[PDB]
């Protein structure tokens, strides 16, 4: 997260750390007690997922849990066309007990509104290229599909939307993939992709447009 | 080393999968290295997977 700040501890209790070899590679979002939503590019054959974290060190962090997941399913059109449909659902091996520091967030059924201010959080790289100690929060504004399309042509696809691109250089960054973009309390997006470097003036980040996947998400979880 | 034809020049996914460049910079992922190659106009090899060591 570029030009954000420390989230208040446990203020984003849906946040999931995807870790392997004790190194965070992506986040996810707890959407039901047994289901974590993440970007399809974060796919692995099995997962170790940290819930209720602030620092990534579980033994500090009372109430945290490191949970296991063997099953995940990527959206059937992921990467067709390139970078599109970047979502996947991870089914945890056990339902987690929710608490003050671990709980689910509802997914928006409405599509993003240009000009909305939204919150994104994660443990990815900072402006200075270092990693944060604790979970970072930043606010970014949604831009119109005409902006998104011009800036990412020919890669823009309705499964995506753009946020940020301000002069303030607020963005998500590498390591933030799969984490949440929250607009008015609903999960609107997942961090998906952008350009190098992150937080370029005038260049928004790209997010998975979850309003296009309501049917698929519901059909997958409910079966 | 890097095959940049497997990525788009227009975007890179934001997963952290670091590689160490022959330029002594750790790149967040191979796609990001590939962008630097294109931005800076010079080829950069991958010394190893993971972050660069110190010295």
Author numbering:
A (entry chain A): 31 to 253
B (entry chain C): 12 to 66
Can I see the authors' text?
By screening of scaffolds which met requirements as therapeutic proteins, we selected serine protease inhibitor Kazal-type 2 (SPINK2) as a protein scaffold, followed by constructing an engineered SPINK2 library. SPINK2 comprises a constrained region containing disulfide bonds, and a flexible loop region. Using a series of phage display screening experiments and a diverse engineered SPINK2 library, we succeeded in acquiring quite specific inhibitors for every target protease tested with sub-nanomolar Ki values and picomolar KD values. Further, generation of a crystal structure provided insights into the mechanism underlying the high affinity specific binding of those inhibitors for their target molecules, suggesting that the engineered SPINK2 inhibitors preferentially bind to the groove of target proteases via the engineered flexible loop, supported by its constrained structure.
In addition, the KLK4/8 dual inhibitor, K41043 had IC50 values of 2.1 and 14 nM for KLK4 and KLK8, respectively. The randomized region of K41043 directed to the catalytic pocket of KLK4, and K41043 residue Asn23 formed a hydrogen bond with the catalytic His71 of KLK4. The S1 pocket of KLK4 was deeply buried by K41043 residue Arg24, forming a salt bridge and hydrogen bonds. In addition, K41043 formed a 310-helix at the randomized region of the crystal structure, whereas this was not observed in the wild-type SPINK2. In contrast, there were conformational differences between wild-type SPINK2 and K41043, which were primarily observed the in randomized region; the maximum distance between them was 11.4 Å (Cαs). There were few conformational differences in KLK4 with or without K41043; the root-mean-square deviation value between them was 0.346 Å from 190 Cαs. The binding loop of K41043 was entirely buried in this large area, providing a high level of conformational complementarity, and there were no water molecules within 7 Å of the catalytic His71 of KLK4. In the KLK4–K41043 co-crystal structure, there were no water molecules within 7 Å from the catalytic His71 of KLK4. This may be because binding of K41043 to KLK4 excluded the water molecules essential for protease turnover, hence K41043 acted as an inhibitor, but not as a substrate. It revealed that 25 residues of KLK4 within 4 Å from K41043 were located not only in the S1 pocket, including the catalytic residues (His71 and Ser207), but also in a surface distant from the S1 pocket. In the KLK4–K41043 structure, the entire interaction surface area was 863.3 Å2, and included salt bridges, hydrogen bonds, and hydrophobic contacts.
